[PDB]
Amino acid sequence: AEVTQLSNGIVVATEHNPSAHTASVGVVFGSGAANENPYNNGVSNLWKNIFLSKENSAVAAKEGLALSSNISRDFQSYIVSSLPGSTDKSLDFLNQSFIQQKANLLSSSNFEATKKSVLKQVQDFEENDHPNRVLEHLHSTAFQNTPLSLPTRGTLESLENLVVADLESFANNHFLNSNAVVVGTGNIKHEDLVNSIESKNLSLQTGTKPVLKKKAAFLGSEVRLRDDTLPKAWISLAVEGEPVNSPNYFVAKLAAQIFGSYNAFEPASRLQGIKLLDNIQEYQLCDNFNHFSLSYKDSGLWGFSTATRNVTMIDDLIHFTLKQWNRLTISVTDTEVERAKSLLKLQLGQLYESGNPVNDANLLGAEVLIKGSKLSLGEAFKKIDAITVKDVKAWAGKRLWDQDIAIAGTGQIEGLLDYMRIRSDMSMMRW
Template identity: 45%
Template sequence: MLRSTILKRTYANIPLTGAPKVTQVNNITVITKPSVSKVKDVSLVFGNAGSSHENYYNNGVSQVVAESFISNNAEKAFTNGFKVNSSVGKEFQTFTASGADVSKALSMLQESALTQETLLNNFKAIQDKVVSKTINYESSQYAKIVDEHLHATAFQNTPLSVPVSGTSETISSLVDTDVSEFINKSLTQNTLTIVQQGSELNHEKFVELVSKLQLNKVSNTSTPFVKSEFIGSEVRLRDDTLPKAWWSIAVEGESVTSPNYYVAKVAANVFGSFNLVEPFSRKQGSKLVNDVLEYEIIDSFNHFSKSYKNTGLWGFAAESTKIQQIDEFTHFALKQWNRLTVSVTDLEVARAKQALKLQIASEESIESLAGLIAGGAEVASLEQQFEAIDKITAADIKNWASEKVWDRDIAISGTGQIEDLFDYVRIRNDMSMMRW
C-alpha cells in the first residue's frame, strides 16, 4: 500500500492554539483564548455560582436559571444566527452564545443573562420542565448519580456535597424569590469572567466591546468562599431490580492550583478507561486492561482526576453486568494503584502523558475552562499545558502516589446489584500492601 506524504504532512501540521490573553476592565476579567475547534464562542463565566453555592433547600436553582436562559432565548438567538447554552458545574455557571458576530453576542448576553427580569420569565413553566428532566435523570443516569453520591459522601456537609443536577423534590418546591436571591448572591459582577474562544481573535477589540456593557443591574456583592473537606466514608444504594452494578472509589485529589495538578491527571491516565464494546479499548496496553480482558470481569471503567478550588477527587468509576465479579475488579484496580508507588514504568508514564495530551486537545470546552477560572487557576495555552505534562517523570508519579494514594482513606459509592462490593474496611485495607 502506498503511503501518502500529503496525509503525513496534514497530521504533522495540526496547529496549536497560542497563548490566551487576559485583561481586567470594569472589575471584570476578560479572556480571549485561541481555539481551532471553536467558532467565536462568547461565554459569561460566574465563578461564585454552581451547586456548591446552593444549599439543601434550594438545590437545583442553578438548573432553573440555566433552563430559563436557554428556553427564553433559543428562538431569538436562532433568528439572529446564534446558538445559546448554559452549563452548571460544582463551582461555576456559564452562559454562552455561539455565532460569528461578537458584538451581537455580547448584546444578547447582556439582555438575557445579566438581567434578572429576563431570567425570571415563565418561571412556572420552566420549573416544571426542569423537574421533568430531573425525574428522568434520576431514573436513568445511574453512573452520574453514583458520581454525585461519591461527592456527597466524600465532602459531607460541605459545599461540594451538593449535587449539580439538583433533586426533583427541591426543584419542585422552589419559588421565584429563591431564584432572585440566588441570582443576587451568585451571579455577581466581581466574580464574572467573559471569555471569547475561536480563531482569528482580536483581544483589544473584544475588551473594548466588554467595557461598553451596562452592568448596573448586576449585583457586586458575593458570598465568602467555604472550603470543602474530604472524609473517608461510603454510601450504597443497593437495588437488585437494576440490570447491573455501578460503583466508584476515590481518594482525595488535587486542587486546580496544586503544583501536582497534571501529575494526578497523568497518574489517572496510567490506567485510563476501558469499554468492553469498543475495539480500541482492548489495545491500550495498560496492565489493568490486560487483567480485565484476561478474566472478563467488567463492562467498563474510567479513571478520573477531578479538581476544584481547594481539593479534588482521584479514583475510578465502573459498571458491570458481571455482578459476582465486582470484588475481583476492585481488588485488581487497587493493587494497580499500589503499584504506582513502587513500580510504575517510564513507558507507562509516556503513554499516559500522550493520552492526557489528546484528551486535553479534544476537550476545549467552556466547562473545562470555567472550572479552572472558578478555582483561580491560570488559563494556559495548549503549548503551556503540554510543556508541563512533558516534564512529569515516573519518579514524580511515585512520589505523588506515595503521598496521596498509598494507605489513604477512600470514599465509596455504588448502586444497582452491588451485593458483591466488599465492605469498607476490607477495601480500605487494599490501599496498602507488603512491599518486601
C-alpha cells in the first residue's frame, strides 16, 4: 500500500492495487458548495447532473465505461471506471466530453430537461428525508452569513433563476489546472498513467480561482421547524469542532467514539459498553442516536443527532446526554479510552480499505488538494495509540466546558425547552 504524487504541470496521484479487478480514473477540483454565493447556489449540483445525463452516459456505455460524480462543501469529482485493460479509453472520454467540448452538453434541449429533474429531487428531499435535512439546517444556523452555510444541493428558490450563462461563468473561474488533481485507483500503475497524459498535452486553463473574503465563524443559535403532523421528533446539536490540519484532529474523533451510535431494535446494540445507555433504556428515551466529528478547511462541528417517538420526555434525553459530556473534563476513566481506541481503528480501517475504487478516488483526491500528500493508515494508527486520558481532559476543557451550542429540530418538538435551559447544562456547578 503506497501512494505516489508527481507534478509536471499537472498534479497526478495514484494508489495501485494489483489484486483489484477494475480501475478508476478521474479529476477532482478544489471548489465545493462553500465557493458559491446565495444567488448561484446549486450550480455545482447542476454540473454533476449534466455530466451524468443520458446522452453522455450512452457514449460511455458503448465503450464499456461507467460514470460517477460527488458534490461536497470543499471539493467535487468526476470519475470514469472501466476494466483494467481499457484505461486509455477512459482517459480519452474525460478529454473529449469534459475538457475540450462543452457546447454538446450545454444545448438548450439538454439543459431544460436536466433542470427539471434536479428540481424534483430537491423537492422530494425537503419533504421526506427528515434526518438529513435537519443536519443541513444545523450547518446554516451555526455558520450564518458565511460561506460554510450554503446547502450542497441548493434551494428551490435559487435553482429556478439559473441559466446556461451561470454555469459557464462558474466553470471559467474554478475548473482550472491549478485547482485540479488527476487521480487513479484500483488496478493501474503510476508510470502508465503519467505517460498516457504526457503522450498528449492536456491543460485546462492558466490562472487562479477567486478568493473569498469572509472566513468561517461559529455562532451560537437555533432554528425550529415544528410540524405536528409528523410521527417523530428529529434533533441535532453541536459545538464548534476541529478543521483539517488540526493537531487535535484524532483526539476529537476518539471523543465521539466514546459515546458512539445506538439502535434500540438491534439486540447487540443494546449491550455496548457505553454508560449513557443505562439512563436511556430505563424509560426508552429514543430510537437511535449517533455522534460525529466533522472537519472542513476552516472549521468543524462536534455533536450528535437523534430520533424519538417519546415526545413527552425530550427534556430528559437532552439532559442525560449533556451530563455525560461533562465527564470528559472531570472523570473519564482509562478503560473507556482503551475501548474507544480499538473501535476508532476498526472504523477508520473499514473506511479506507473497502473494495470500491470509486470511494478510494474521492478520498485520495480530497486529501492531496489540501495537504499536498496523503497520510498512510499505518501512521494514523500510531497517533491514535499515543493518546492518553490527560489529552482527552485537556481537549474537552477547551472545546466543551461552558461553550456555546447550535440546535436544529423538526417534527413534534414542543417538549424541547428553550436555549438557556440547554446552554446551562454545558457546565456542572459542582466543579
